[PDB]
Each structure stands twice: as C-alpha cells, then as structure tokens.
C-alpha cells in the first residue's frame, strides 16, 4: 500500500485559494490505464498527463523499465475529495509522486513544491506564490521548491516567512527529483 | 445477506443520511459499474476505495488478478435518491473487501469517513445528522474519522449513550472493526 | 411470452402499463437498453442484470452466459419517455425468462424496485399504476410488501377486482410470474 | 432494390416518403446510423437489428453476422431532420434484404413501430403518411393493424388508389415487401 | 509531372457551403499505415461529417469493382481534411467529392486537373440534387475551374446561371457515382479494360 | 524523446510565442494532446501527425512507427487558452524531431497552417506574432509565403532585427529548422 503509493506535498490552486495539497499516486500491476480523481479541473488533469509523459520519456534514465506503462495502472488522487482544485502548479509534485511510486524511492519529509511542468522537463513559473508560501509556512513545511522564474516574487513575501523556509528555485525536473527523493534517482 | 453490504453514513438529497451500500463481484473480465444516482464526488470515492483494495490485495487475501477476472458492481438503493460527497469512502472500501473475500460485515455497524489512497481516514461534515440517522436505523456500532472526535461535543448525550462510537485513523482499523472474520 | 413482462412504471403520461422486452441473442456480453429510458430506469436495468448474474446457477442459467450472450432491453412505446426504478423486478423477471426459456404469465403485472440483494423496495404512484392494470384487464398484480398500506388510498372497487400479491424478494416474484417452476 | 426500403415517418416538414438505405459490408461489427436521425429513430434501428439477430437462423442469415459485418443505415436527404419510431419495420426490412441479398419491392411503402418480439405497433400522422405515399406514386402500403381505424379520417379518393395491407407482425411485412420469400 | 501527379492523389475540389458562403472546398485525403481508423477534420459540421461516412461506405461496398483489397484496406488509416482549418463548412453537397477523394487515396489514382464537383451521395451511388447551385458555380468560375460535375436533377437550375458562366464551364450532369469517378480520375476506376473491334 | 519547436500562434492572453512539445514514447498508437487547446488547434495536431505518417519513409522514420509509439503533443503554458491553425508547421517539425532524434534550432520560430499535401498556408495576426518573436529574442522566423504582403505593415525595427524566411512547403521548413 504505502509501498505502491507515492505521496508528495504540492502547493496549488483550490477553490478557496492556493493551498497545501497531498498528491497521492498508486502504481499497481495492470495494463496501462490512467485514472485521476480529486475534484480536478481540466488544466490540472492535463498537468497529470504531462507529468506522466515526462516519466515515460525518461524511464530508462530513472532506472524504470521503459515498457512499464503496459504493465501498470496508475491512479493519481488529490484529497480532500470534495474540494475543487485546478491549475498547473502541482505539475512537478505529480511528476515526483509518479517517479517515487514507480521506483520505490520515498519522498522526503518536510518538503513541499510548486511549479508547472513541461514535457521537456523545464519548470515554469506559477502565480500566487505568496499565498502558497504562507500555506507551507502555516503547515510547518521546512523546504519548498519553486520555479526559478519565481525568484522575483520572493520580494513580496514577509521577511519572517522567508527566514523560516528553505527555498530552492529550480529550473528543471532533474533538480526537483534530486531534492525531493530520499535516494539519488 | 451481509456479504458486500455495508451501512454507510453519507450525504443524500434528503439530508445527510444513511446508505445501504451493495456490491456484487462476479467472474468477469474486469468491468466496474457504479449505480444509484451517485454524484461525481461519490463516484470518485469508489475509484479511490477500489485502488486501496488493489494496492493491498495480497495482504487482504485477495487474488491480485481480480481486477482482470472479476466484474464489480457497486449499487446504492434507493435508486432514485441523489447521493454525493466523499463520506462513504471507507464504507465503499469495506464493501469491496467483503465482496471480494466472502467475509461478511458485522450486523448493526455503520461507518462514515473519506478514504485516501494511503488508507488514512479523513474527517467529514454533518456528523450530527449522520449519527441521528444511525440511531434511527438501529445501528449499535459507528465508525467515524478520528478528527471528527470534537464534533461529538455538539451531539445530544441521548444519541451518544446508545451508540458505540469508534474514531478511526486508518483503513485497517475499519476492516478489523467492520468485518466478521 | 418469453422475454416479455408486463410492468407498471412511470411514463411521461404518468404511471402506466408497459411491456418490458428482453432479447438474449448470441454475442460477447454487450448490454443495450432502449425505449426513451431515463437514467434512473437505465440503472435499474443494470441492477436487475447483476441480480441474474449473481444468481445464475441457482436460476438454472449457465453462469458464463454473459460472455456468450448479448442483451437488449427494450420498452415500447419507443417515443414515450419513461423513468424511475419501478420496473426493476420486471426487468429481472424478463431477463430470467429470456435466459431460461421460461414463459412469463400474461395475466400478471408487476411493479417494484429491485436491489442487488434481490429485495423488493416500495414505489410511488401505486394508485395510478393499479388503475392502469385494471383498465388493461390484468387480473394479478405483484407489488412491494411495503406498499400494502398504500392500497387503502385506492378505490375499493378497483382493488376488489385485483388479485394482489405483496412480495419482499425476487424469488417470490419469479415463483408467481413464471409459467414454469424456476 | 437490395437494402433500400420506402418508409413513411416524421421529418421536419412532416410525415413523408423516406428512402431507407442499408449496406452490410464485411467488417467486424461496426454499426453506423446517418441521415440527421433523432434519438428515437436511432433506437428503432437498434430494435430492428435485434429483431434480425433473434431470427437470423430462420431468415437464412448466419448468426455471426453482427461479428462479421459492418452495417450502415442511412436515410437521405442528409440535411433533413428525421425522428420517431415509424420507420422501424422499414429498418428491419432493409436489414434483412441487405443481409440476404433479397431485393425489396419498389412499389411497396411501409410504416410502423417495431418491437423486439417482432410485433408492429400503431403510429401517428397516418394521414400525412398516406398522402405522401400517394403523391409519391406508391401503389401498396403496409400499415400497422391497429391503425385501420385511422383510415376513415383520410380522403376516400386517396385510400381508393392505395392497396393497403394492415399487418400485425414482422414476418407478414417481410413476405409482402421482399421480392423473394424470406 | 510525377510530382504534380502524386500531389493530385486524394485531392478533390468540391463545391459546398462554408461560413463564407456556398464556396470552393479543397478536400484532402491521406491513406497511411494503420488499423482501419477514419479521421475527418476541417471545422466540419455534423451533416458534412455524415456525408463522409456515407461516401466511405460507398467505396467499401464497391471495393472489388474498385480493386481495393480488404487486406490492404484494414491495414490503413484514413484522414479526410478540408483546409482552411478554421473555416466552418457543412452540408451534404461535398458527398461525391469525398467519395472521389477516398477512391483516389486508396488506389493511388490521381484526380484530373481543373475539375470541381458538387452533389449529395447516397449509399446506392445515386447523386442527389443540391441547393445554391448558382453561388457554387460562381465560386467555380471565379476559381478558373474548367469542368464541373453537378447532379442531373440540378440541370433545371442552370437556367438562372448566366450565359458566360455556362460558356466558360464544361458542365457534366451526373446521375451515379460511377460516372463521377470516370470523369474525375485519370485512370478508369471500375473494371478491367476490354478492347473490341467490329 | 521530446521534440520542441518555437511556434507563433494565437493565445487568449499573453504573447503569441509558444513552445510546441511532442513526446514519442513506447506505446501502441495513442495520441494525446494538451495545453488548453481549442478545437481548430486540436485538428491542426491531427493534420501535422498525418503529414508525418504519410512521409515517414522519406523522412527516415519506420512507416509502421505508430504501432509501437504513443505521441503526446503539449503546448505550454498549460492554462493559457490557445487556438487556430498557426502552430501546424511547428507541430509537424516537433514530431519529425522527436521521431528522428534531430534537434530543432532554438533561435528559429515558425508560424503557418499545414495541409495534408505539405503546403504552408497563410495565417492571420502576423504583426502580433512577429512582435512576440521579437520580444522573445528570436533570431529567425519562418512564415508562410503568402504572408509576405503582410510584412509591409510590420515595424522596421522588427523587420531589421528578424531574419524572416517565407516558406511554401513543409520540406523547406524542415531543412531550415532541423539542425543536422
């Protein structure tokens, strides 16, 4: 269960604003079906497809059998089930959760992350960084990964929050995985 | 018959309410049917519950090929009454496990709680109406999410007195308390 | 009389006499339902089918029928909207009849919601349903046991002419409605 | 003549002459229905197809046809909306013709709703339907048996020119409409 | 010559309705390795989509006579596309053009230069009359189309079309798909050729 | 196994400069397309894919590649509504790149509608597109040949800064945009 379920703390848009989200993924023996649930809007659904494609494209580099998708079913779920969520900001979290699940490489505690993923692996800036970082801070998150191009937004963040968080701006998904996973992918 | 049948407490168009959840599992090719005027959030809770079972199949004594060899139908009468929300999550999981294992559900048990893929039980809303419905249904044991403990403090001690309430944190606790074997 | 059951269920005109048809031809397990059916009525067809699949062997049906038969449930008149769960037991009865070749009694009408456990749950609009049966010249009507008290709000002259069998379970329905002992 | 049947059913302008086409090429069981058909008309095609499957053997049709053939039902003119169940017996006839290579008689028109049991049910707008048939130079029209009474609301001069066959069931239809005996 | 010709395979000028009026349609088809899939694109309305379905069925029913093997056919995916991609197009009037394009694509038989066509297709291969003939023929004339195939039942509608447009266009009224294919394709599509002498 | 090409195409918000991404991963012939795409743009992806499929052999691609690959076309930014046919040639280029492993020049952007016959059709809003290319720091821009007329109304500073190549056909696009 835990073994077959990747778990990542993302920061992304919910109906009442940017918030901490626990992104869960299961990767059970199957035949290649992708399921995704959690009152997800279409942009967020599309971010999951992109995140899965990034992993399929890089399977060999990640030490994953390149034909895993014919022998796995994947379910991405984002509780709370009734709360509407949307937008692309959970993309790097989805990718991280999937890699974790497919490799058995656990996700670090005390880490949250926000950022739009692309098929090429680049991490794109997101909006509402202040709201997101405050949520991480309130939630007792120690380390936050943000898109490199959101560095400019750190200025508007209250000083005390900046001091409490360990903030890593990342350009690419390789950096995200190195920082977020317990072992070296 | 108590196999595959679980009393859930979850939201209905006629108030936060009691749900008689039915499941059937027959030899098939792996098709999943869910019926009973279920809203999208409730349908998703079924998918989540089923994934929990798949992830834990061997530990649960279920053949991990059931997804390929069994057709599963989840149905929630009354057929015309709209039902929705995530609160039947742990009941869906319990019903599925029971159906797949032939392990009957205990009489006079109901449960309410949102399920996650990791198996943690999350708090729900409208606890008072759910327990009221439980009380009128002659339920004796009710499983609720651990975080709904505080909400008990707004509930008539009449109802509290006649119910054996178990706040649960995880799905394993649920299966242990709900199943006969 | 095989694969044909007289049900009483809601239509756009109101609760009415309807002939539920079922065909179970050679195929690979495909379900089709037609007849201007609302989603609640569609779901009742699925529940009815699951009841049969779950009890196939005790019903005298080859348990692996569902990968060697295609099934079409049709409810004329094709253009008249119909909905609700009240044809459930009729759907189940028609499926059993079609799959076993046991003809359905033409003197019998039935109404009732079915559950996967094979319980018969009470319905609404009993008065309008039983008036339709009477006007149709139906002698015997099966109703859900919990609808017995609703009989008191239907004219006694109509009820006096009807042989009413309140039922709790699908086995009672099949016993009363099928020409031959299942 | 093969796979083409003259029907009478509702279009946006009214009940009128429909030419119903079917093709049944080798394939793997794809069903396509075109010609701006409304949902009720689409369901009548499904009902008609099931009637044929249920009687395939008796009609000289191999049972495996739903597995071996792609079937396309098309009703020109393509842009004209059509709906209702009154083309049911024509759909059934067209399918039987196509699947057996038995030519349809071009002097016959037909209207009627079909059931899975192969009964022919009464339809609406019989006057508009027969006027169209008559304006169209049709000599023989098959109508549902229970529409006989509706003939008396239609000008006698129109009815006098028509050879009208009331039918109760599908095998009558096929015998009257197909060139060779089915 | 080789280049121009294969650039005419699966390419047909139809005359049918667009949001910029009854106009010229450049219909394209590609037949590539596949599994029997059909795709159709080009901001097509439902009625036009159905005419493509009917056109394909016509081709399928005549596969033997057209020398298209089922073996080959089920190993192919077909994509019908009608640029410009964003312009809405609808109606049944491109039916015979769709059929011509499909036959061409599947048999590698190049469409003749400077032909356009309009007509509703039926499963029996009949060409049914269309609306807006004038505007369609105006669009063909404006485009320097030399030869236009139209439905036989539309011949009566030619009286509203000016003398010069009738002068510049070689109009062939057609009753059946067989006539359309013979007139539109470079090689005779139906049946082997038998030469007789008196 | 991800191809990437800079396209100029219509968006509801922000600039018209986009990165068209295509992945071609082990699969069984499924097409996925994402990026808040309107229907016309979705269709342009299908057209681009078919162009490649029809020319596979000549492009150095196994003709039956689609049996064993899945293709995902994604157009960031993911939440930006975008539409129109103008990314067509970029989509074609990205697919060829992905399937051959030939990288795309990053200093090149392109705009144009693609047909199945491989012709490049003119597009609208050339001015907004070239401005986005200019602000984006793009050196070279491929535009449809029939759009040349439209260059007359572009700022001279933009004209002076950009290397504009009008193109008529997909083969011209490929030789200009692909590196090797």
């Amino acid at each position: 269960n835990e073994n077959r379920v990747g778990q990542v703390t993302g920061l992304a848009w919910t109906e009442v604003g940017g918030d901490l989200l626990t992104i869960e993924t299961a990767c059970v023996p199957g035949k290649g079906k992708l399921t995704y649930t959690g009152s997800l809007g279409e942009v967020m659904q599309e971010s999951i497809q992109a995140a899965l494609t990034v992993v399929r494209a890089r399977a060999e580099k990640l030490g994953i059998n390149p034909d895993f998708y014919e022998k796995r079913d994947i379910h991405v779920h984002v509780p709370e089930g009734a709360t509407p969520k949307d937008g692309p900001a959970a993309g790097i979290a989805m990718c991280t959760a999937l890699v974790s699940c497919l490799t058995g490489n656990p996700v670090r505690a005390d880490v949250a992350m926000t950022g739009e993923i692309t098929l090429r692996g680049q991490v794109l800036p997101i909006g509402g960084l202040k709201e997101k970082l405050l949520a991480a801070h309130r939630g007792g998150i120690k380390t936050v990964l943000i898109p490199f191009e959101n560095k400019r937004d750190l200025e508007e963040i209250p000083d005390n929050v900046i001091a409490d968080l360990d903030i890593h701006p990342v350009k690419r998904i390789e950096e995200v995985l190195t920082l977020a996973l317990q072992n070296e992918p």
Side-chain angles (χ1 to χ4, degrees), chain A:
Chain A
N1 174 84
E2 283 129 43
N3 232 68
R4 294 277 117 105
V5 174
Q7 243 185 101
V8 177
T9 305
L11 293 156
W13 189 81
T14 75
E15 182 166 62
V16 293
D19 207 354
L20 286 172
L21 257 36
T22 303
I23 282 73
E24 303 184 290
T25 59
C27 53
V28 298
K31 35 74 233 303
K33 193 65 209 320
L34 176 61
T35 303
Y36 39 81
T37 54
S39 290
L40 316 173
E42 277 194 273
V43 171
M44 181 166 275
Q45 298 169 23
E46 294 195 346
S47 80
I48 295 174
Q49 299 177 282
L52 178 53
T53 297
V54 169
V55 183
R56 297 169 71 182
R58 296 167 181 249
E60 292 175 289
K61 293 205 240 156
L62 297 174
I64 305 169
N65 184 276
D67 283 73
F68 79 92
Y69 197 45
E70 70 193 350
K71 296 206 52 168
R72 243 59 184 169
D73 287 341
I74 307 287
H75 184 170
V76 181
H77 182 69
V78 195
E80 304 159 356
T83 301
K85 310 171 189 68
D86 203 2
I92 60 171
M94 290 149 177
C95 193
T96 297
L98 289 169
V99 171
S100 178
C101 185
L102 295 167
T103 63
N105 194 345
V107 182
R108 289 194 199 256
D110 298 28
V111 179
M113 63 184 72
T114 191
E116 172 170 346
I117 196 169
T118 54
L119 299 192
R120 68 198 184 267
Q122 252 208 297
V123 181
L124 302 190
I126 46 73
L129 185 73
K130 178 179 177 152
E131 186 174 39
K132 288 165 173 61
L133 295 190
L134 297 182
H137 187 256
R138 267 202 165 84
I141 295 292
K142 146 191 245 165
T143 302
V144 187
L145 312 183
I146 71 171
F148 191 85
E149 280 163 296
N150 278 119
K151 276 162 56 188
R152 207 175 181 182
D153 294 326
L154 296 176
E155 299 191 8
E156 303 267 333
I157 314 301
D159 285 343
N160 72 294
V161 179
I162 286 295
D164 285 339
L165 296 176
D166 178 29
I167 296 173
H168 299 246
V170 296
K171 299 183 190 178
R172 300 174 71 195
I173 189 66
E174 14 277 319
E175 297 178 84
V176 176
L177 298 180
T178 299
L179 289 169
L181 296 171
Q182 180 186 296
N183 5 113
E184 315 74 13

